[PDB]
Amino acid sequence: MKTIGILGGMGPLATAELFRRIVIKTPAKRDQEHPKVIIFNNPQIPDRTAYILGKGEDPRPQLIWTAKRLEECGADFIIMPCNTAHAFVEDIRKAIKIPIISMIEETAKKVKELGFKKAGLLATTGTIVSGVYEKEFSKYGVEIMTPTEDEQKDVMRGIYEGVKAGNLKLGRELLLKTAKILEERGAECIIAGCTEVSVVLKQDDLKVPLIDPMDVIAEVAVKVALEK
Amino acid sequence: MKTIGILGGMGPLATAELFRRIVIKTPAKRDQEHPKVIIFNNPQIPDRTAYILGKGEDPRPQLIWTAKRLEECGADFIIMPCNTAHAFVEDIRKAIKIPIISMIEETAKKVKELGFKKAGLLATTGTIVSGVYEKEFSKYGVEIMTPTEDEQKDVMRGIYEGVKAGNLKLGRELLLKTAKILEERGAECIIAGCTEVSVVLKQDDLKVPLIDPMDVIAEVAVKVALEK
């Protein structure tokens, strides 16, 4: 058995959703068969996007602090429910002894294993600018495709002012329209970069595989926790 | 600001749900305004009901061990997303230094504050046998009303063979029917003793207030974490 450590708070809601998915994706008939999970939800970690752009506070000190605390509290490995935070995965790795399993890298590995060569990405602008998906996917020979700047404004509006704001119709309209556009351009799979995307967008709305990075990391974490 | 500690794993899904509700009930303009939360999800704690009904080992030693680890990790106070575990709340409190806020007692306080004198309880048989709600509600002068033995079997079926199995139609059919029976017998409010109840039973379905203990403890935890 290995204890799953979750470095969260980026944001709180995404952290709670990752935890729920781990539980749902756990094969068990009784409580006692589920893996141990230690979550340190630290919302005070400075905004990742604001820093990426070059004007906000460095989020690495709090990120590293949280990683070290999880280790001290008993985690055997760490996962993070935040795309942009993975831009500092190497910084965090250098400060701790236990490993961090990357949600971005595991998704790239999965995409490669399924044979896809081109992937359409639906995510926040901060995520794209951070380049985390582009970096890891390229390492695995997979080409990333994103919407145009105008279309990206729609993705952002659909995710924030749409889903997150409680306006599902506006979110699904903006996000589904963009998903099919990427498919039209040759995307072999669609990457649901934010949980908000999986809410209003379902596999039944697309002709190509729909991949949710949070499901990928939750599945990897469960496997490692139960098989190691 | 105080760090909320959650002694979980009883069971994993309920722990994840308590966390989500804390986030949902937190007033904030940005992530950084949300309180820190440390969750020690330990599914290996011995079954509570089993010990209650006398066919299982004592869960206190490991409940206490988990609470101590949670305290060591950094929690300023502890809450537990499990009804039966509260049967041992005094044992846990005596063993640790930080406070434990009882979901059962805070619910009893809320019910009295709202002027109810009789409450219909929808929960597991184990919860009823433990008597935690009866003990606390009586302290605050509120009378508890539960289903008959046969109706209680329907409740257990609705929660387990229904909601937990993914069959919401069965879950709702059995739970709504029992809720209405309790209303007919004079229940001034319905206590949703399990998160499963809140999934298929909504306020609009009843002529009396639906009180969810998990929402109550979530609200208290947020208040205490951000107050004074």
CSV table of C-alpha atoms in Angstrom, one decimal:
chain,number,residue,atom,x,y,z
A,1,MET,CA,0.0,0.0,0.0
A,2,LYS,CA,1.1,3.6,-0.7
A,3,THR,CA,-0.6,6.7,0.7
A,4,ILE,CA,-1.8,9.2,-1.9
A,5,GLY,CA,-0.8,12.8,-1.1
A,6,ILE,CA,-2.8,15.6,-2.8
A,7,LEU,CA,-1.2,19.0,-3.0
A,8,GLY,CA,-4.3,21.1,-3.5
A,9,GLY,CA,-6.0,24.4,-3.0
A,10,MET,CA,-5.6,25.3,-6.7
A,11,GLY,CA,-8.4,25.8,-6.4
A,12,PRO,CA,-10.3,24.2,-3.5
A,13,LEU,CA,-13.1,23.0,-5.7
A,14,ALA,CA,-10.8,21.2,-8.2
A,15,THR,CA,-9.1,19.6,-5.2
A,16,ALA,CA,-12.4,18.2,-3.8
A,17,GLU,CA,-13.3,16.9,-7.3
A,18,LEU,CA,-10.0,15.1,-7.7
A,19,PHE,CA,-10.5,13.4,-4.3
A,20,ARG,CA,-14.1,12.4,-5.3
A,21,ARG,CA,-12.8,10.9,-8.6
A,22,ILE,CA,-10.2,8.8,-6.8
A,23,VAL,CA,-12.9,7.4,-4.6
A,24,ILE,CA,-15.2,6.6,-7.5
A,25,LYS,CA,-12.4,5.0,-9.5
A,26,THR,CA,-11.4,2.8,-6.6
A,27,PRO,CA,-12.4,-0.9,-6.9
A,28,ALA,CA,-13.7,-1.9,-3.4
A,29,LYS,CA,-16.7,-3.5,-1.7
A,30,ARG,CA,-15.9,-2.2,1.8
A,31,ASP,CA,-14.5,1.0,3.3
A,32,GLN,CA,-11.3,-0.8,4.5
A,33,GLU,CA,-10.2,-1.7,0.9
A,34,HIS,CA,-9.8,1.9,-0.1
A,35,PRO,CA,-6.4,3.6,-0.2
A,36,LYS,CA,-5.2,6.2,2.4
A,37,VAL,CA,-5.3,9.8,1.1
A,38,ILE,CA,-3.8,12.8,2.8
A,39,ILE,CA,-4.9,16.1,1.4
A,40,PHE,CA,-3.4,19.4,2.1
A,41,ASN,CA,-5.7,22.0,0.7
A,42,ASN,CA,-3.6,25.3,0.8
A,43,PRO,CA,-5.6,28.0,-1.0
A,44,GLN,CA,-3.0,30.6,0.0
A,45,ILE,CA,-0.7,29.4,-2.8
A,46,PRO,CA,-0.4,32.6,-5.0
A,47,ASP,CA,-2.2,32.7,-8.3
A,48,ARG,CA,-0.3,30.6,-10.9
A,49,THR,CA,-1.4,32.5,-14.0
A,50,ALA,CA,-0.7,35.9,-12.5
A,51,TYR,CA,2.9,34.8,-11.9
A,52,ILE,CA,3.3,33.2,-15.3
A,53,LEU,CA,2.4,36.5,-17.0
A,54,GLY,CA,5.0,38.2,-14.8
A,55,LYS,CA,3.3,40.5,-12.2
A,56,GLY,CA,2.0,38.3,-9.3
A,57,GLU,CA,3.8,36.7,-6.3
A,58,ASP,CA,6.0,33.6,-6.9
A,59,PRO,CA,3.8,30.6,-6.0
A,60,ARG,CA,6.7,28.2,-5.5
A,61,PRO,CA,7.4,28.9,-1.8
A,62,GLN,CA,3.9,27.8,-0.8
A,63,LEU,CA,3.9,25.0,-3.3
A,64,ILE,CA,7.1,23.6,-2.0
A,65,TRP,CA,6.0,24.1,1.6
A,66,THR,CA,2.8,22.2,1.0
A,67,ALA,CA,4.7,19.3,-0.7
A,68,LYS,CA,7.2,19.1,2.2
A,69,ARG,CA,4.3,19.1,4.7
A,70,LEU,CA,2.5,16.2,2.8
A,71,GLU,CA,5.7,14.2,3.0
A,72,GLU,CA,6.0,15.0,6.7
A,73,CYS,CA,2.4,14.0,7.3
A,74,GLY,CA,2.8,10.6,5.7
A,75,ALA,CA,2.2,10.8,1.9
A,76,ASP,CA,4.2,8.3,-0.2
A,77,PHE,CA,3.7,10.2,-3.4
A,78,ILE,CA,2.1,13.5,-4.5
A,79,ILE,CA,-0.4,14.5,-7.2
A,80,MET,CA,-1.7,18.1,-7.9
A,81,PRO,CA,-5.1,19.0,-9.2
A,82,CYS,CA,-3.9,22.1,-11.1
A,83,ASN,CA,-2.4,22.3,-14.7
A,84,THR,CA,-0.4,25.5,-14.4
A,85,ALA,CA,1.2,24.4,-11.1
A,86,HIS,CA,3.0,21.7,-13.1
A,87,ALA,CA,5.1,24.4,-14.7
A,88,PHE,CA,7.1,24.2,-11.4
A,89,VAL,CA,7.0,20.4,-11.0
A,90,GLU,CA,10.8,20.3,-11.2
A,91,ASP,CA,11.2,23.0,-8.5
A,92,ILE,CA,9.0,21.0,-6.2
A,93,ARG,CA,10.7,17.7,-7.0
A,94,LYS,CA,14.1,19.1,-6.0
A,95,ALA,CA,12.8,20.0,-2.5
A,96,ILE,CA,11.3,16.7,-1.5
A,97,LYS,CA,12.2,13.0,-1.2
A,98,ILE,CA,8.9,11.4,-2.3
A,99,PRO,CA,8.0,11.6,-6.0
A,100,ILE,CA,5.3,13.7,-7.7
A,101,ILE,CA,3.3,11.9,-10.4
A,102,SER,CA,2.5,14.5,-13.0
A,103,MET,CA,-1.1,14.7,-14.3
A,104,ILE,CA,0.3,16.4,-17.4
A,105,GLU,CA,2.9,13.7,-18.1
A,106,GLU,CA,0.5,10.8,-17.3
A,107,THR,CA,-2.0,12.2,-19.8
A,108,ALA,CA,0.8,12.5,-22.5
A,109,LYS,CA,1.8,8.9,-21.9
A,110,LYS,CA,-1.8,7.8,-22.2
A,111,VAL,CA,-2.4,9.7,-25.4
A,112,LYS,CA,0.8,8.2,-26.9
A,113,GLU,CA,-0.1,4.7,-25.8
A,114,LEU,CA,-3.5,5.1,-27.6
A,115,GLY,CA,-1.6,6.0,-30.8
A,116,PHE,CA,-2.8,9.6,-31.2
A,117,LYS,CA,-0.4,12.0,-33.0
A,118,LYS,CA,-2.5,15.2,-32.7
A,119,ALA,CA,-4.5,16.4,-29.8
A,120,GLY,CA,-7.0,19.3,-29.4
A,121,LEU,CA,-6.6,21.1,-26.1
A,122,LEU,CA,-9.4,22.9,-24.3
A,123,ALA,CA,-8.0,24.7,-21.3
A,124,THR,CA,-7.4,28.1,-19.7
A,125,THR,CA,-5.1,30.7,-21.3
A,126,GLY,CA,-2.8,30.6,-18.3
A,127,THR,CA,-2.5,26.8,-18.9
A,128,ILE,CA,-1.6,27.3,-22.5
A,129,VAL,CA,0.9,30.1,-21.9
A,130,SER,CA,2.6,28.0,-19.3
A,131,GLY,CA,3.1,25.5,-22.0
A,132,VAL,CA,2.9,22.5,-19.8
A,133,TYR,CA,0.8,20.4,-22.2
A,134,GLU,CA,2.9,21.4,-25.2
A,135,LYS,CA,6.2,20.4,-23.4
A,136,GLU,CA,5.1,17.0,-22.1
A,137,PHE,CA,3.1,16.0,-25.2
A,138,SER,CA,6.0,16.8,-27.5
A,139,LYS,CA,8.3,14.7,-25.3
A,140,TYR,CA,5.9,11.8,-26.3
A,141,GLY,CA,5.7,12.8,-30.0
A,142,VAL,CA,2.2,14.2,-29.8
A,143,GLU,CA,1.3,17.5,-31.4
A,144,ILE,CA,-0.9,20.0,-29.5
A,145,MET,CA,-3.5,22.0,-31.2
A,146,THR,CA,-5.3,25.0,-29.5
A,147,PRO,CA,-8.1,27.3,-30.6
A,148,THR,CA,-7.4,30.7,-32.2
A,149,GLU,CA,-7.1,33.7,-29.9
A,150,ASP,CA,-10.7,34.7,-30.6
A,151,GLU,CA,-11.9,31.1,-30.1
A,152,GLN,CA,-9.8,30.9,-26.9
A,153,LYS,CA,-11.7,33.9,-25.5
A,154,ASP,CA,-14.8,31.8,-25.9
A,155,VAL,CA,-13.3,28.8,-24.1
A,156,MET,CA,-12.4,31.1,-21.2
A,157,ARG,CA,-15.8,32.8,-21.2
A,158,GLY,CA,-17.5,29.4,-21.3
A,159,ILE,CA,-15.4,28.0,-18.5
A,160,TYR,CA,-15.5,31.0,-16.1
A,161,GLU,CA,-18.5,33.3,-16.8
A,162,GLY,CA,-20.2,30.1,-18.1
A,163,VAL,CA,-19.8,26.9,-16.1
A,164,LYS,CA,-18.1,28.2,-13.0
A,165,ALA,CA,-20.7,31.0,-12.8
A,166,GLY,CA,-23.5,28.5,-12.8
A,167,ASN,CA,-24.6,29.3,-16.4
A,168,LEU,CA,-24.4,25.9,-18.0
A,169,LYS,CA,-26.1,26.7,-21.3
A,170,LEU,CA,-23.6,29.5,-22.0
A,171,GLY,CA,-20.7,27.2,-21.1
A,172,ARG,CA,-21.8,24.3,-23.2
A,173,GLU,CA,-22.6,26.5,-26.2
A,174,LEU,CA,-19.1,28.1,-26.1
A,175,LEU,CA,-17.2,24.9,-25.3
A,176,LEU,CA,-19.0,22.5,-27.6
A,177,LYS,CA,-18.7,24.8,-30.5
A,178,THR,CA,-14.9,25.0,-30.0
A,179,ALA,CA,-14.6,21.2,-29.5
A,180,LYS,CA,-16.0,20.4,-32.9
A,181,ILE,CA,-13.9,23.1,-34.5
A,182,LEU,CA,-10.7,21.4,-33.3
A,183,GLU,CA,-12.1,18.0,-34.6
A,184,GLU,CA,-12.7,19.6,-38.0
A,185,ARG,CA,-9.0,20.6,-38.0
A,186,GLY,CA,-7.9,17.0,-37.5
A,187,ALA,CA,-7.7,16.6,-33.7
A,188,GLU,CA,-7.6,12.8,-33.0
A,189,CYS,CA,-8.7,13.3,-29.4
A,190,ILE,CA,-10.0,16.2,-27.3
A,191,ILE,CA,-8.3,17.0,-24.0
A,192,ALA,CA,-10.7,18.4,-21.3
A,193,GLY,CA,-8.2,20.6,-19.6
A,194,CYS,CA,-10.6,21.9,-16.9
A,195,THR,CA,-13.2,19.9,-14.9
A,196,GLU,CA,-15.7,22.5,-16.1
A,197,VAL,CA,-15.3,21.0,-19.6
A,198,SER,CA,-16.4,17.5,-18.6
A,199,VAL,CA,-19.5,19.0,-16.9
A,200,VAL,CA,-21.1,20.4,-20.1
A,201,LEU,CA,-19.2,18.4,-22.7
A,202,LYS,CA,-19.7,14.6,-22.9
A,203,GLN,CA,-18.1,11.8,-25.0
A,204,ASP,CA,-21.5,11.5,-26.9
A,205,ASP,CA,-21.0,15.0,-28.3
A,206,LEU,CA,-17.7,14.1,-30.1
A,207,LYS,CA,-16.5,11.6,-32.8
A,208,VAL,CA,-13.0,11.4,-31.3
A,209,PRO,CA,-11.9,10.1,-27.9
A,210,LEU,CA,-12.5,12.5,-25.0
A,211,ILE,CA,-9.6,12.5,-22.5
A,212,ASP,CA,-9.9,14.1,-19.0
A,213,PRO,CA,-6.5,14.6,-17.3
A,214,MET,CA,-8.1,14.5,-13.9
A,215,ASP,CA,-9.5,11.0,-14.6
A,216,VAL,CA,-6.1,10.0,-15.8
A,217,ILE,CA,-4.2,11.1,-12.7
A,218,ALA,CA,-7.0,9.7,-10.4
A,219,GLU,CA,-6.6,6.3,-12.1
A,220,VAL,CA,-2.9,6.3,-11.9
A,221,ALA,CA,-2.9,7.3,-8.3
A,222,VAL,CA,-5.4,4.6,-7.4
A,223,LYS,CA,-3.3,2.0,-9.2
A,224,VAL,CA,0.0,3.0,-7.5
A,225,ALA,CA,-1.7,3.2,-4.1
A,226,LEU,CA,-3.2,-0.3,-4.4
A,227,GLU,CA,-0.5,-2.1,-6.4
A,228,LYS,CA,2.7,-0.9,-4.8
B,1,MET,CA,-7.5,31.9,10.0
B,2,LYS,CA,-7.7,28.4,11.3
B,3,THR,CA,-6.8,25.1,9.6
B,4,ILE,CA,-9.8,22.7,9.3
B,5,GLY,CA,-8.9,19.1,10.0
B,6,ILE,CA,-11.0,16.3,8.7
B,7,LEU,CA,-10.7,12.8,10.2
B,8,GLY,CA,-12.1,10.8,7.3
B,9,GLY,CA,-12.2,7.5,5.6
B,10,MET,CA,-15.6,6.6,7.1
B,11,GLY,CA,-16.3,6.2,4.4
B,12,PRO,CA,-14.1,7.8,1.6
B,13,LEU,CA,-17.0,9.1,-0.4
B,14,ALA,CA,-18.6,10.8,2.6
B,15,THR,CA,-15.2,12.4,3.4
B,16,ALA,CA,-14.9,13.8,-0.1
B,17,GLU,CA,-18.5,15.2,0.0
B,18,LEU,CA,-17.9,17.0,3.4
B,19,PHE,CA,-14.9,18.6,1.8
B,20,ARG,CA,-16.9,19.7,-1.3
B,21,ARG,CA,-19.6,21.2,0.9
B,22,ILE,CA,-17.0,23.2,2.9
B,23,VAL,CA,-15.8,24.7,-0.4
B,24,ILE,CA,-19.3,25.3,-1.6
B,25,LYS,CA,-20.3,27.1,1.7
B,26,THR,CA,-17.2,29.3,1.8
B,27,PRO,CA,-17.7,32.9,0.9
B,28,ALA,CA,-14.7,34.1,-1.2
B,29,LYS,CA,-13.8,36.4,-4.1
B,30,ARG,CA,-10.7,34.4,-4.8
B,31,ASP,CA,-9.0,31.1,-4.0
B,32,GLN,CA,-6.7,32.7,-1.5
B,33,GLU,CA,-9.6,33.6,0.8
B,34,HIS,CA,-10.6,29.9,1.3
B,35,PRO,CA,-9.5,28.3,4.6
B,36,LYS,CA,-6.8,25.6,4.7
B,37,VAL,CA,-8.1,22.1,5.0
B,38,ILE,CA,-6.1,19.0,6.0
B,39,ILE,CA,-7.8,15.7,5.3
B,40,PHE,CA,-6.5,12.4,6.7
B,41,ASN,CA,-8.6,9.8,4.9
B,42,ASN,CA,-8.0,6.5,6.7
B,43,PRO,CA,-10.4,3.8,5.4
B,44,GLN,CA,-8.7,1.2,7.5
B,45,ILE,CA,-10.3,2.3,10.8
B,46,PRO,CA,-12.4,-0.6,12.0
B,47,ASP,CA,-16.1,-0.6,11.1
B,48,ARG,CA,-18.1,1.5,13.6
B,49,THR,CA,-21.5,-0.1,13.1
B,50,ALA,CA,-20.0,-3.6,13.5
B,51,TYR,CA,-18.6,-2.7,16.9
B,52,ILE,CA,-21.8,-1.0,17.9
B,53,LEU,CA,-23.9,-4.0,17.1
B,54,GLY,CA,-21.3,-6.0,19.0
B,55,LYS,CA,-19.9,-8.1,16.1
B,56,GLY,CA,-16.6,-6.2,15.5
B,57,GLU,CA,-13.5,-4.9,17.1
B,58,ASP,CA,-13.0,-1.6,18.9
B,59,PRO,CA,-12.4,1.3,16.5
B,60,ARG,CA,-11.3,3.8,19.2
B,61,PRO,CA,-7.5,3.0,19.1
B,62,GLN,CA,-7.3,3.8,15.4
B,63,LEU,CA,-9.7,6.7,15.5
B,64,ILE,CA,-7.4,8.2,18.1
B,65,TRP,CA,-4.3,7.4,16.1
B,66,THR,CA,-5.8,9.1,13.0
B,67,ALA,CA,-6.8,12.2,15.1
B,68,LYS,CA,-3.3,12.5,16.5
B,69,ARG,CA,-1.7,12.3,13.1
B,70,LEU,CA,-4.2,15.0,11.9
B,71,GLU,CA,-3.2,17.2,14.8
B,72,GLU,CA,0.5,16.7,14.1
B,73,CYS,CA,0.0,17.5,10.4
B,74,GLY,CA,-1.4,20.9,11.4
B,75,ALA,CA,-5.2,20.9,12.1
B,76,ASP,CA,-6.4,23.5,14.6
B,77,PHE,CA,-9.7,21.6,15.2
B,78,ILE,CA,-11.3,18.4,13.9
B,79,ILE,CA,-14.6,17.4,12.3
B,80,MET,CA,-15.7,13.8,11.2
B,81,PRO,CA,-18.0,12.9,8.3
B,82,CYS,CA,-19.4,9.9,10.1
B,83,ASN,CA,-22.4,9.6,12.4
B,84,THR,CA,-21.5,6.4,14.3
B,85,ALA,CA,-17.9,7.6,14.9
B,86,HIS,CA,-19.4,10.4,17.1
B,87,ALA,CA,-20.4,7.7,19.6
B,88,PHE,CA,-16.8,7.8,20.6
B,89,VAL,CA,-16.3,11.6,20.4
B,90,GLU,CA,-15.5,12.0,24.1
B,91,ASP,CA,-12.9,9.2,23.9
B,92,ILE,CA,-11.2,11.0,21.0
B,93,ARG,CA,-11.4,14.4,22.7
B,94,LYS,CA,-9.8,13.1,25.9
B,95,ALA,CA,-6.9,11.7,23.8
B,96,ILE,CA,-6.0,14.8,21.9
B,97,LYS,CA,-5.3,18.5,22.5
B,98,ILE,CA,-7.1,20.2,19.7
B,99,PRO,CA,-11.0,20.6,19.8
B,100,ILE,CA,-13.4,18.3,18.0
B,101,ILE,CA,-16.5,19.9,16.7
B,102,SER,CA,-19.4,17.4,16.7
B,103,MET,CA,-21.6,17.2,13.6
B,104,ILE,CA,-24.2,15.6,15.8
B,105,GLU,CA,-24.3,18.3,18.5
B,106,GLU,CA,-24.1,21.2,16.0
B,107,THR,CA,-27.1,19.7,14.2
B,108,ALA,CA,-29.0,19.4,17.5
B,109,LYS,CA,-28.2,23.0,18.2
B,110,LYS,CA,-29.4,24.1,14.8
B,111,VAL,CA,-32.7,22.1,15.1
B,112,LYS,CA,-33.5,23.8,18.4
B,113,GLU,CA,-32.5,27.2,17.1
B,114,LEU,CA,-35.1,26.7,14.3
B,115,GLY,CA,-37.8,25.8,16.9
B,116,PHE,CA,-38.4,22.2,16.0
B,117,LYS,CA,-39.7,19.8,18.7
B,118,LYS,CA,-39.9,16.6,16.8
B,119,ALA,CA,-37.6,15.5,14.0
B,120,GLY,CA,-37.9,12.6,11.6
B,121,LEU,CA,-34.5,10.9,11.1
B,122,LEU,CA,-33.5,9.1,7.9
B,123,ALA,CA,-30.2,7.3,8.5
B,124,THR,CA,-28.5,3.9,8.7
B,125,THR,CA,-29.6,1.3,11.2
B,126,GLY,CA,-26.2,1.5,12.8
B,127,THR,CA,-26.5,5.2,13.3
B,128,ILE,CA,-29.9,4.7,15.0
B,129,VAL,CA,-28.6,1.9,17.2
B,130,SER,CA,-25.6,4.0,18.3
B,131,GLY,CA,-28.1,6.5,19.6
B,132,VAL,CA,-25.9,9.6,18.8
B,133,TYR,CA,-28.8,11.7,17.4
B,134,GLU,CA,-31.2,10.6,20.2
B,135,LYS,CA,-28.7,11.4,22.9
B,136,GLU,CA,-27.8,14.9,21.5
B,137,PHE,CA,-31.3,15.9,20.4
B,138,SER,CA,-32.7,15.0,23.8
B,139,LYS,CA,-30.2,17.3,25.5
B,140,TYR,CA,-31.6,20.2,23.5
B,141,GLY,CA,-35.2,19.1,24.1
B,142,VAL,CA,-36.0,17.7,20.6
B,143,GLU,CA,-37.8,14.4,20.1
B,144,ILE,CA,-36.5,12.0,17.5
B,145,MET,CA,-38.8,9.9,15.3
B,146,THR,CA,-37.5,7.0,13.2
B,147,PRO,CA,-39.2,4.6,10.7
B,148,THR,CA,-40.6,1.2,11.8
B,149,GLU,CA,-38.3,-1.8,11.5
B,150,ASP,CA,-39.8,-2.7,8.1
B,151,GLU,CA,-39.7,0.9,6.8
B,152,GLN,CA,-36.1,1.1,8.1
B,153,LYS,CA,-35.3,-1.8,5.8
B,154,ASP,CA,-36.7,0.3,3.0
B,155,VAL,CA,-34.4,3.2,4.0
B,156,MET,CA,-31.3,0.9,4.1
B,157,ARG,CA,-32.3,-0.5,0.7
B,158,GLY,CA,-32.8,3.0,-0.7
B,159,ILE,CA,-29.4,4.2,0.5
B,160,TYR,CA,-27.4,1.1,-0.4
B,161,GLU,CA,-29.1,-0.9,-3.1
B,162,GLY,CA,-30.3,2.4,-4.5
B,163,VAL,CA,-28.2,5.5,-4.4
B,164,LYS,CA,-24.9,3.9,-3.6
B,165,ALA,CA,-25.5,1.4,-6.5
B,166,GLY,CA,-26.2,4.3,-8.9
B,167,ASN,CA,-29.9,3.6,-9.1
B,168,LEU,CA,-31.5,7.0,-8.2
B,169,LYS,CA,-35.0,5.9,-9.1
B,170,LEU,CA,-35.0,3.1,-6.6
B,171,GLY,CA,-33.3,5.3,-4.0
B,172,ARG,CA,-35.8,8.2,-4.5
B,173,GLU,CA,-38.8,6.0,-4.5
B,174,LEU,CA,-38.0,4.3,-1.2
B,175,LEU,CA,-36.6,7.4,0.6
B,176,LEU,CA,-39.3,9.9,-0.5
B,177,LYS,CA,-42.0,7.4,0.5
B,178,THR,CA,-40.5,7.1,4.0
B,179,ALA,CA,-39.9,10.8,4.3
B,180,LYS,CA,-43.6,11.4,3.6
B,181,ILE,CA,-44.6,8.8,6.1
B,182,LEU,CA,-42.6,10.6,8.8
B,183,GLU,CA,-44.2,13.9,7.8
B,184,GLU,CA,-47.6,12.3,8.2
B,185,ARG,CA,-46.7,11.2,11.7
B,186,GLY,CA,-45.8,14.7,12.8
B,187,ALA,CA,-42.1,15.2,11.9
B,188,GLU,CA,-41.5,19.0,11.9
B,189,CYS,CA,-38.3,18.5,9.9
B,190,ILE,CA,-36.5,15.7,8.2
B,191,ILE,CA,-32.9,14.9,9.1
B,192,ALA,CA,-30.9,13.6,6.1
B,193,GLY,CA,-28.6,11.4,8.1
B,194,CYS,CA,-26.7,10.2,5.0
B,195,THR,CA,-25.4,12.1,2.0
B,196,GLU,CA,-27.3,9.6,-0.2
B,197,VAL,CA,-30.5,11.0,1.2
B,198,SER,CA,-29.8,14.5,0.0
B,199,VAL,CA,-29.0,13.2,-3.5
B,200,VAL,CA,-32.6,12.0,-4.2
B,201,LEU,CA,-34.6,14.0,-1.6
B,202,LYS,CA,-34.9,17.7,-2.2
B,203,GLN,CA,-36.5,20.5,-0.2
B,204,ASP,CA,-39.2,21.0,-2.8
B,205,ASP,CA,-40.2,17.4,-2.3
B,206,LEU,CA,-41.2,18.1,1.3
B,207,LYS,CA,-43.7,20.2,3.3
B,208,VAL,CA,-41.2,20.5,6.2
B,209,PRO,CA,-37.6,21.7,6.4
B,210,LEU,CA,-34.9,19.2,5.2
B,211,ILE,CA,-31.9,19.4,7.6
B,212,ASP,CA,-28.6,18.0,6.4
B,213,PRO,CA,-26.1,17.4,9.2
B,214,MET,CA,-23.2,17.5,6.7
B,215,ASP,CA,-24.2,21.0,5.6
B,216,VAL,CA,-24.5,22.1,9.2
B,217,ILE,CA,-21.0,20.9,10.2
B,218,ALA,CA,-19.6,22.3,7.0
B,219,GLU,CA,-21.0,25.7,7.8
B,220,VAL,CA,-19.8,25.6,11.4
B,221,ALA,CA,-16.3,24.6,10.2
B,222,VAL,CA,-16.1,27.5,7.8
B,223,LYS,CA,-17.3,29.9,10.4
B,224,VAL,CA,-14.8,28.7,13.0
B,225,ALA,CA,-12.0,28.6,10.5
B,226,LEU,CA,-12.6,32.2,9.3
B,227,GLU,CA,-14.0,33.8,12.5
B,228,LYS,CA,-12.5,35.9,15.3
